[model samples]
Target: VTLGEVWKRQLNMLGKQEFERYKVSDITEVDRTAARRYLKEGRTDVGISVSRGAAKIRWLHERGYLRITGRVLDLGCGRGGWSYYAAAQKEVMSVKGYTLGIEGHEKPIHMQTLGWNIVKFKDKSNVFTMPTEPSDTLLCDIGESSSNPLVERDRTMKVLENFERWKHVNTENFCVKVLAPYHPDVIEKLERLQLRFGGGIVRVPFSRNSTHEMYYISGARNNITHMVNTTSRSLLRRMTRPSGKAIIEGDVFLPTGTR
Candidate 1:
């Protein structure tokens, strides 16, 4: 389906009350202007589309890759679209609970005009020039639409190195989405990184009409299994209680010693 359709579906799921809580605006004109500027700069991969942004947020949020709590670090934040969307939903209001969006291209004046709470920084380096503060989640959604194999490999390695460094600094969540024409060597490097970090990779279509796919690599040590086991044990305990409910035939199992 088209990104607009995806965004509409997401909005329906969010409902009116939740949608009203978000700090978003109708910035289609701004997005169009930014898209035009990116096109002029030969950056076909870094255009701004609110629908596309919402679709991306939906995908990540549904999969538990995007957390709306604590400090968030956004690298290569194109037009600050994703960062703005995320920062608006972040309910925490502490010293370290803000979102910082770093971009190498330039400042997003359009987004700044909206008076968003996201921290903006301008730097030419993608990952190395990031702030030296601890972040709960690190987001990077930048990649080459076309590049030499060696150049792509080097770029991917730089991101991986930054991820390793961030992990050492107590950043546990990572989500990196690279646009297509991704090099095979880069994919191999990402696979190895996943092996070390214990997460999985996903291939998502860039858009409804686009043939290329975006490689999404995310890592997080989740306690889903623990939660499930706890719920199961509670249910078993309730079932084994001596309530006066009628028991079905052949439902009881003998203990090992009794058997």
Candidate 2:
């Protein structure tokens, strides 16, 4: 099966009810209102709308990239939207959402509305003070600020390096959202990191209008495959027979019978 098909199958296992909770439907006035409130109150970073945040989480969840378990670390968490959504998942034990700026302080309050008490929020510039404990999943949404994208990129790289050196051994999954124009550097760094750890990395474009991309980095081997399985021959056929007749139907074909 193809990698995307595998991802879709895994999400299908979660059932429709659970999936609906994470899915981002149409962006309405309510979403815009909440976004405006948060933006004005400085609870979330600039360029962060309710629709955008919801879409980001949904993208990760649909692809089986948002593997929330045991303990989760939300670096660069904005308004705690990701944390609140993640905390609601069944597999997640706890969530810690942190930000280098003052944007994420309102996350805990947001969680209280839903009676979700498993999440905690912190506003610390340095990730070293964030935590050294092993996290099951680490999520970082980088390059959301309009002030200085380069600074955000640098800080995010540092956070990833720190996580790799200290937290990767116990961390099973890593998901990062990098906005457009600044994603190349971060992608290269993630590739090298994945190489050193011998895990898999998958990158998917966020949307057509928005050139951003979401990256999933696994610490264990065989967790996710980056290649598409395009060959028409089945594994059994390919292994057992070197030559065969190509059977064609419609636009598809099947090779069978040994020569």
Candidate 3:
């Protein structure tokens, strides 16, 4: 299917705000080129048609993979596209974005675009929007998308509200995202969030560019956390190879794995 068609399917399944978890073969012939371009443009950083990271994150969390709730919080939401993408209808309901601009790094217009989509979908479904935000969820593709570090962190930090300062992003739960090489004082700084928020703190950690790790932290109910360690014997998804078994990633993932 074309990007438009696939997007339609996703919009149909959950809503316009969420994306369906799909495979490369799931993409139609008319869209093969578009899908390639989407990948080439680094949409995986935020704009994505299919996502396996959350699957892996939840898989690790389901069996006690990390601390606290499986909730997620997106620290730097650019367009809220990634937050929407990472959130699965079954696992997470409340997803939040924190925008922080970095020096030499202009904020992506997609940030507000995502916020706009959220408001558009807000009246429609409780499945996607939570009345309040909490931390018992998984956050993906937050921080690190920005080019400037200090400025991004500073900008992102401004969004963190104390549980007492305001209502949780939701009435029931909430989640948040932050960058890694987690600050030594992140825990201390976010103490109010972790302590006062619902559930407890859950850190769903990931490394995108090797040097930068994205941490999804949340404190909400029915949260899903993804992690790198899993006990079961598994055929790990090759990070550097194409999945020929998967029609879409045949060339892309294959090269990624080999490289």
Candidate 4:
């Protein structure tokens, strides 16, 4: 029913305009067919279906694992247990869940039924390693593999996202996370990455697993914005300004802006 219709019904119950008027600030959309639809009875049952992910959310909340910021993201919302956790935290402003289970031409329209709004859904089968996407927050599964045929590219992305968030949080210093095990030449490879924030790469070997190592890179997002000068300058401007110590060496320095 429309707002008017619902309000009219309420007015009748109250009688004589006891409930005068109202403005709609929000609208709730509900799906009745989802397995977890009902908020009571079925969902609240203590010993029904075995769901460890759901348990983790409760555990995190009780132990204060829950943290909040302006942006919220779930790297993989397989069973959507953490999604519930993020939602329950009043400090969170937004929640975006994504997984390799979704992607390509066809989309999983069923997520809306499950009451999840997936921000970026990618398929596991067809996806390969690529440069990471930037986001404010990432929910990473720590127990997942960095080895084996299991789709572990997400782990790389999770680590990258983690460091990205950290650097953002601590703007004074740049921190990074890398795979504990990967290419032997990972350090040199990161230097070749040539990102503006990159400084020097460090490899820390784990005492328990000497074979395992993580790479850390220090720096800010980018160094500078390069702009080419094309405008002409007069002799008077050159003598007066004496600005811009030309970018490249061996080339004559030009005062003010010039081609």
Best by lDDT: 2
- Across residues 173-204, which tens digit of lDDT does each residue of candidate 1 receive? 66765432234454566556656765554433
Task: Please rank every candidate by lDDT, starting with the best.
Answer: 2, 1, 3, 4
Show pairs that collide, candidate 4: none
Model 2, 1-259: lDDT tens digits are 3322333334345445444432222111122454456556855323333334545565457667556677888876766667766665667788887777654443333423231467787765456565566788887765443334455457556656665754467777776654322234655666677676655544332232112233545533442222212211122222233232222212101121111
lDDT of 2: 0.49
- Backbone clash total for model 2 is 0
Computed on alpha carbons, the lDDT of every model, listed in order, comes to 0.44, 0.49, 0.34, 0.33
Candidate 4, after superposition: displacement of residue 32 in Å? 21
Lowest summed lDDT across 10 adjacent residues in model 1 is found at 250-259
Rank ordering of all candidates by TM-score, starting from the highest: 2, 1, 3, 4
Best by TM-score: 2
- What is candidate 3's lDDT per residue for 163-219, written digit by digit as tens? 233334443433344442233334345544545553433333222221223333432
**Candidate 4, after superposition: displacement of residue 163 in Å?**
5.6
RMSD after CA superposition, every candidate: 19.9, 16.8, 16.0, 27.2
Tell me the spans in candidate 1 whose CA falls farther than 4 Å from its real position: 1-54, 91-106, 110-115, 118-120, 123-126, 129-131, 179-184, 207-259
- Tens digits of per-residue lDDT, candidate 4, 64-153, equal 333333355554455444544454454545555554554342222222222233223433522224333443444543324433312333
Separate clash counts for every candidate = 0, 0, 47, 0
